[PDB]
Design a protein around this motif. Structure first.
Motif, mmCIF file in Angstrom:
data_model
loop_
_atom_site.group_PDB
_atom_site.id
_atom_site.type_symbol
_atom_site.label_atom_id
_atom_site.label_comp_id
_atom_site.label_asym_id
_atom_site.label_seq_id
_atom_site.Cartn_x
_atom_site.Cartn_y
_atom_site.Cartn_z
ATOM 1 N N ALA A 36 26.500 44.358 29.471
ATOM 2 C CA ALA A 36 25.420 43.521 29.948
ATOM 3 C C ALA A 36 25.624 42.022 29.712
ATOM 4 O O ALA A 36 25.408 41.258 30.653
ATOM 5 C CB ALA A 36 24.055 44.024 29.457
ATOM 6 N N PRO A 37 26.089 41.525 28.569
ATOM 7 C CA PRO A 37 26.452 40.123 28.414
ATOM 8 C C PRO A 37 27.516 39.675 29.385
ATOM 9 O O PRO A 37 27.379 38.622 30.011
ATOM 10 C CB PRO A 37 26.959 40.026 26.972
ATOM 11 N N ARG A 38 28.605 40.447 29.530
ATOM 12 C CA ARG A 38 29.652 40.108 30.457
ATOM 13 C C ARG A 38 29.181 40.116 31.894
ATOM 14 O O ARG A 38 29.495 39.209 32.652
ATOM 15 C CB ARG A 38 30.930 40.948 30.288
ATOM 16 N N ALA A 39 28.388 41.112 32.309
ATOM 17 C CA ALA A 39 27.766 41.151 33.613
ATOM 18 C C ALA A 39 26.915 39.914 33.893
ATOM 19 O O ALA A 39 27.014 39.300 34.952
ATOM 20 C CB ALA A 39 26.901 42.415 33.746
ATOM 21 N N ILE A 40 26.121 39.464 32.912
ATOM 22 C CA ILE A 40 25.392 38.210 32.955
ATOM 23 C C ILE A 40 26.342 37.030 33.142
ATOM 24 O O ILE A 40 26.128 36.164 33.990
ATOM 25 C CB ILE A 40 24.456 38.078 31.752
ATOM 26 N N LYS A 41 27.467 36.994 32.410
ATOM 27 C CA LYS A 41 28.495 35.988 32.591
ATOM 28 C C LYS A 41 29.114 36.015 33.989
ATOM 29 O O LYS A 41 29.259 34.980 34.643
ATOM 30 C CB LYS A 41 29.587 36.139 31.511
ATOM 31 N N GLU A 42 29.448 37.206 34.511
ATOM 32 C CA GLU A 42 29.859 37.407 35.886
ATOM 33 C C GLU A 42 28.813 36.925 36.892
ATOM 34 O O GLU A 42 29.155 36.247 37.855
ATOM 35 C CB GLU A 42 30.209 38.884 36.207
ATOM 36 N N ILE A 43 27.514 37.208 36.674
ATOM 37 C CA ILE A 43 26.406 36.688 37.465
ATOM 38 C C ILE A 43 26.419 35.169 37.527
ATOM 39 O O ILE A 43 26.391 34.580 38.608
ATOM 40 C CB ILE A 43 25.049 37.208 37.002
ATOM 41 N N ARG A 44 26.513 34.475 36.376
ATOM 42 C CA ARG A 44 26.635 33.029 36.368
ATOM 43 C C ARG A 44 27.892 32.558 37.100
ATOM 44 O O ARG A 44 27.847 31.662 37.942
ATOM 45 C CB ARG A 44 26.641 32.458 34.919
ATOM 46 N N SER A 45 29.048 33.190 36.832
ATOM 47 C CA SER A 45 30.293 32.917 37.535
ATOM 48 C C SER A 45 30.257 33.091 39.053
ATOM 49 O O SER A 45 30.685 32.212 39.798
ATOM 50 C CB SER A 45 31.447 33.781 36.966
ATOM 51 N N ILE A 46 29.703 34.203 39.572
ATOM 52 C CA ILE A 46 29.550 34.451 40.999
ATOM 53 C C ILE A 46 28.624 33.462 41.677
ATOM 54 O O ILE A 46 28.941 32.888 42.717
ATOM 55 C CB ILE A 46 29.271 35.903 41.377
#
Lengths: 96, 380
Positions: free
Chosen positions: A23-33
């Motif tokens: 979930a933290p990494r997915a959030i990071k991916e969300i910000r990145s995308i």
RNA sequence: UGUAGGAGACCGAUAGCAAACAAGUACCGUGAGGGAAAGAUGAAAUAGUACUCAGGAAUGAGCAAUUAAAUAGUACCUGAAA
RNA sequence: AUACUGACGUGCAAAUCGUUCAUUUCAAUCACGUUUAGGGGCGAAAGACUAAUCGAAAAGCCUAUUAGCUGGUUAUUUUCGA
RNA sequence: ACAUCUCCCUAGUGCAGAUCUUGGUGGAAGUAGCAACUAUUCAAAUGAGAACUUUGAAGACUGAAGUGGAGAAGGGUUUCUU
RNA sequence: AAUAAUCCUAUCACCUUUUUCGUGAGCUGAGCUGUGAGCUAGGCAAUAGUUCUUUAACAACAAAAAAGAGCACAAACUGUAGACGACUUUUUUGCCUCAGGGUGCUGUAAACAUGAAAGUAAACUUUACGAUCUGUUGAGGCUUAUCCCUAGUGGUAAAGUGU
């Protein structure tokens, strides 16, 4: 400047990362995308969306999320990205 | 002192260094040799490995335990877009080896050919082959005459047509193909007449032929000695590790004796597989391309759901007996045998009973989508 | 030995008393005990860095400035070798 | 504190950490206070222990002990030379 | 503050080395390494500057043999505000 | 049949008078000029006080005139590759993105039945409670992350650096 509505498949993004960090990494991916989409370093992220993602714990993601992105000036320039509430993501193509 | 018990060494010394190949394209080490009586012909072809299937074949094999009875066999499928010849190479024999005299080009070339030279096709003004757009036909003729007179080996510069493929790459693979057969003049006439045309595998090869296969292997990066060389694993008790290395060896040489197994690259190596039989040369416009004398049912070669990571077959194709080096999607180089194979199996003529077209993703039984629907019936 | 004088063909800050000094101290040891490192700007700081500019600040630079002298600015004499 | 002769073995640690294992109502365990001191104590004995110290503790001194033995033992030229 | 070869007395009098003594310093090296103990995210505020400050929202954990309360030894203003 | 004990080969400065042959260039094969080689006639040069290199060769560069004729790296994308470089790619006849279909994988979702269900209790035959099971229901879910197809949706920036 523009406001767009998109559907993110989180499952593909979340695939490589361990339970604890999913979930933290997915959030990071969300910000990145979102950064990639709007061409903005400054991506301001909805707590409610994070809460919605994190609500069945960090161990799993939602498969699909509808996010609303707003590019905003005040050179300086940022975007705000936020949750959209709907029952399911069947047929929901991206739009502006 | 000598070892108490003998045991063959791990792996072949002859394939040091176990390192990465410097090209994606297969590299023919040597071509077929002199046969003046034979007419001029092409020796080689590049095609793309699409996947594997299984076959049912009826067997002759005199005096075998199986003998008359039918066998089931694994087979490879290689989609083969027709290569296009674009250049002529003239090589001459010197005590320092074969040396190129000159090359003669076609009167136009493909964009896909030009794409291979450009690293930034998208961000360029594409000026390659534009002074060399044309010269007098007299100049061309003089070069051809010169090559006939002095050169003793002829190769044709051929290239792949990746535009007829689903692959991400749009750059052609460009390649020399030796022409073997009659006189240099007869060869030269043959290459000139052929030139601008497209060559199907059926124009180069015959079904039932035994073929030599040239490819780079599937990668794996840098690996340990156990994986790389297959040594007997360390004991249950150790100070350190279990995939950790054996003893390196003697005090004399006072250096590592190079024949020792070591950690390093595994796969992405260049390799020649020999004598693979062609079971069928398929046809692009045939809708019955998977069918047999036993089956006689409309049915294309393409698997249920297609080949993994390649999908549909839409061009001509080679159905090859057994295993082929490299990944699926990889270009694969076919070469004729340097001396033609003479054996029972070489001479023999294949009679297929069945070619599978079932799924290769899951255990999808059905040959056709129609069969799957027919089984299941009504839907919402 | 304590105190007071007077001395030197003595040492010159890794030497000479352990101590040229806020040293029998700091510091270490359960304790008996063990026990350091440690001086120098200039004639004069009642000459100890004013002022300006750039700096969040530290600092830096200066057409600015003490001195005979500041690669003399208080971790200040000279300033070797590595 | 039995074993994994586990991890660790310029450590988290000059003996730790993990897992396994022995002990658990008595010849039990714990605290505090107290006694017995160096050829002395004390020892369900292993020469065990007696403050990171033991087949004779720590501190200071006789002492700069002694050593036929080990190591080191400092500018130049010339002459005779084992 | 320095010499004397004019003559002559005197000596803590000549160093490359002693696992020399003492002090400084390198190559090794921007390397070894910063691995016990399940996990953080978002937003805001402060400020020159915020992954590890503060506030809030979440996610989590300690899980009454507690990283919770109390007290003894020992430490001693470490407390508390600014 | 001494084979390099050989052959070639330099050294007739000048200008001016005379006769010949080779070759290049301009004019409309030929004529002339230039160049190279010769013959014919003349009177014309040198010179530093004795030696201390006889500057004599090759190649490169700077100035002055005259004349001739864009790549690569990066960035994103890729994953046939990969510790990291490197390698494979693509960058609008594309690519990413979602979505649909294909291919599958799991095994029949929630919801509702005055459906069935071992029994139970409370009315004056009716109404309550009930693990479970069947039906609606091959349902519901999931399938590129290193699956396939789709010119189906919306996207597709930096604009830097070396030459």
């Amino acid at each position: 400047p523009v406001t767009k509505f998109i559907t993110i498949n989180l499952s593909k993004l979340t695939h490589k990362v361990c339970y604890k960090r999913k979930a933290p990494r997915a959030i990071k991916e969300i910000r990145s995308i979102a950064g990639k989409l709007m061409h903005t370093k400054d991506v301001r992220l909805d707590v409610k969306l994070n809460k919605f993602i994190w609500s069945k714990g960090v161990r799993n993601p939602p498969k699909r999320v509808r996010v609303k992105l707003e590019r905003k000036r005040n050179e300086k320039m940022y975007t705000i990205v936020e949750h959209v509430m709907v029952d399911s993501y069947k047929g929901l193509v991206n739009e502006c | 002192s000598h070892r108490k018990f003998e045991r063959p060494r791990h792996g072949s010394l002859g394939f040091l260094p176990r390192k990465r190949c410097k090209r994606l394209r297969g590299k023919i080490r040597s071509f077929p040799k002199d046969d003046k009586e034979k007419p001029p012909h092409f020796t080689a072809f590049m095609g793309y490995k699409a996947g594997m299937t299984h076959i049912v074949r009826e067997v002759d094999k005199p005096g075998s335990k199986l003998h008359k009875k039918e066998i089931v066999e694994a087979c490879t499928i290689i989609e083969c877009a027709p290569m296009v010849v674009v250049g002529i190479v003239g090589y001459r024999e010197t005590p320092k080896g074969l040396r190129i005299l000159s090359t003669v080009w076609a009167n136009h070339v493909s964009d896909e050919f030009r794409r291979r030279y450009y690293k930034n096709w998208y961000k360029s003004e594409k000026k390659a082959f534009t002074k060399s757009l044309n010269v007098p036909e007299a100049t061309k003729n003089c070069l051809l005459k010169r090559i006939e007179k002095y050169c003793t080996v002829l190769r044709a510069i051929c290239h792949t047509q990746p535009s007829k493929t689903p692959l991400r790459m749009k750059k052609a693979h460009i390649m020399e193909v030796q022409i073997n057969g009659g006189s240099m003049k007869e060869k030269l006439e043959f290459v000139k007449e052929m030139l601008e045309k497209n060559l199907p595998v059926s124009t180069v090869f015959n079904p039932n032929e035994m073929i030599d296969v040239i490819s780079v292997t599937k990668g794996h990066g840098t690996k340990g000695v156990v994986s790389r060389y297959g040594v007997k694993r360390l004991p249950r008790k150790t100070h350190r590790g279990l995939r950790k290395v054996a003893c390196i060896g003697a005090w004399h040489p006072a250096r590592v004796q190079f024949q020792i197994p070591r950690h390093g690259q595994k796969g992405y190596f260049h390799r020649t597989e020999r004598n693979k039989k062609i079971y069928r040369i398929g046809l692009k416009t045939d809708k019955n391309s998977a069918s047999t004398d036993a089956d006689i049912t409309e049915k294309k070669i393409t698997p249920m759901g297609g080949f993994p990571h390649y999908g549909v077959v839409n061009e001509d194709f080679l159905l090859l007996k057994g295993c082929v080096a490299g990944t699926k999607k990889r270009p694969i180089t076919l070469r004729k045998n340097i001396v033609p194979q003479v054996s029972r199996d070489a001479l023999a003529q294949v009679s297929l009973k069945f070619i599978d077209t079932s799924s290769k993703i899951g255990h999808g039984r059905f040959q056709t989508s129609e069969e799957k629907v027919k089984y299941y019936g009504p839907l919402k």
